[PDB]
Amino acid sequence: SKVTTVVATPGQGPDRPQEVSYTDTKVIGNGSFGVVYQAKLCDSGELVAIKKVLQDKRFKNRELQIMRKLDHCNIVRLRYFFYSSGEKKDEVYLNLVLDYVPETVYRVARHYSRAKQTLPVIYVKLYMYQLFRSLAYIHSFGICHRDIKPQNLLLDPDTAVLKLCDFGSAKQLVRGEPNVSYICSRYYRAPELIFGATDYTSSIDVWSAGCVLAELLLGQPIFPGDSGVDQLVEIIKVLGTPTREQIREMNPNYTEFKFPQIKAHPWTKVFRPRTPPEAIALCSRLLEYTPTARLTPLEACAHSFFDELRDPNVKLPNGRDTPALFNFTTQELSSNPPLATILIPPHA
Amino acid sequence: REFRFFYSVYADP
Ligand SMILES: [Cl-]
Numbered sequence A: 001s002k003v004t005t006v007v008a009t010p011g012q013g014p015d016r017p018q019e020v021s022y023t024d025t026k027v028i029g030n031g032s033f034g035v036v037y038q039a040k041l042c043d044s045g046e047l048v049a050i051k052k053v054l055q056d057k058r059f060k061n062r063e064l065q066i067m068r069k070l071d072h073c074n075i076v077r078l079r080y081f082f083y084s085s086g087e088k089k090d091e092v093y094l095n096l097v098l099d100y101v102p103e104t105v106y107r108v109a110r111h112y113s114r115a116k117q118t119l120p121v122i123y124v125k126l127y128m129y130q131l132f133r134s135l136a137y138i139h140s141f142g143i144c145h146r147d148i149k150p151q152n153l154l155l156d157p158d159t160a161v162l163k164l165c166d167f168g169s170a171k172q173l174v175r176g177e178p179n180v181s182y183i184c185s186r187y188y189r190a191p192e193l194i195f196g197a198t199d200y201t202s203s204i205d206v207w208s209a210g211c212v213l214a215e216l217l218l219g220q221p222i223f224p225g226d227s228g229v230d231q232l233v234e235i236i237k238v239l240g241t242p243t244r245e246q247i248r249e250m251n252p253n254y255t256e257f258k259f260p261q262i263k264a265h266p267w268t269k270v271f272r273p274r275t276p277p278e279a280i281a282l283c284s285r286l287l288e289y290t291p292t293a294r295l296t297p298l299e300a301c302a303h304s305f306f307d308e309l310r311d312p313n314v315k316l317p318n319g320r321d322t323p324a325l326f327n328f329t330t331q332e333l334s335s336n337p338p339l340a341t342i343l344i345p346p347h348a
Numbered sequence B: 001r002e003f004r005f006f007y008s009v010y011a012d013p
Helices: A062-067 A105-114 A121-140 A203-218 A228-239 A244-250 A277-286 A297-301 A304-310 A337-343
Strands: A004-010 A018-031 A034-041 A047-054 A078-084 A093-099 A153-156 A161-164
Touching: A018 A047, A062 A078, A062 A093, A105 A153, A105 A203, A121 A153, A121 A161, A121 A203, A121 A297, A121 A304, A203 A277, A203 A297, A277 A297, A277 A304, A297 A337
Parallel strands: none
Antiparallel strands: A004 A018, A004 A078, A018 A034, A034 A047, A047 A093, A078 A093, A153 A161
């Protein structure tokens, strides 16, 4: 029954503060700078998630400035933001008020993995297609997420709508300006990140997305390990030993190191026999040593693996309509505009 | 530990 009011600025629209009221506050998760709360907006009854972020008094918050300019059906929407105190004494925190999505792709993946069952391929196509759309959108701004993983893929299981979240590591990459290499989470780090490269591109998101696809097909992470050595061995066991030309494309400081000598394992034996060959073909074009050889997010959306989604008769397993898949904007298509031939089917 | 939320329709907190 307790109603809380704060003055807050809308995530989008005019920079005009307004009174926002919320109730039914409850802890739902953990964050690096405080717990994450769920709340219910009084004006609309909509559920929101509130997370704390350390406000740097020197620079503008990178996560905030990125989220205020993003508007895409497969990206979590910033509703409001305001400042308050919190966990540490004498500290001012930035509060990000986000549309609440109850589940993640990881929860669905572990649900089938625990039951020793395969996630139905139609859900694999839907989740990965929506993920690549969100990547193509942010990459068109030059923004790299730098922390793609199943736990950061919000999911409404009823409508199968996916939304990318957690832009705390996101950065607009500028060629020629170095970046920290310690971003991205274990299992999902591109090999150039394992090699500590400071000169990398948005293609690290595509490698991480390839790791998500392989995990959804395998029922477990494809490149597990608690250290970079253990992760690299699992990568080499699949892709083979990287050639010196490939190491120079990742981090030329590592060209002369001693790596385990293993020939590549055939892609058709990495996954179970019944895995659809289009899914395997797509993974081989995402998990590539050479970053420029990986598909772009927009190229991945047009891959034959997602042809079933462009069927005019595609239906969800429960029977609902598939979510919005073809409402591409000029910004979203800017990396390859004439790709809308495949991406937008005739019935759209 | 490895989950985003405490709660999920697929498991127990
Ligand atoms: Cl999760």
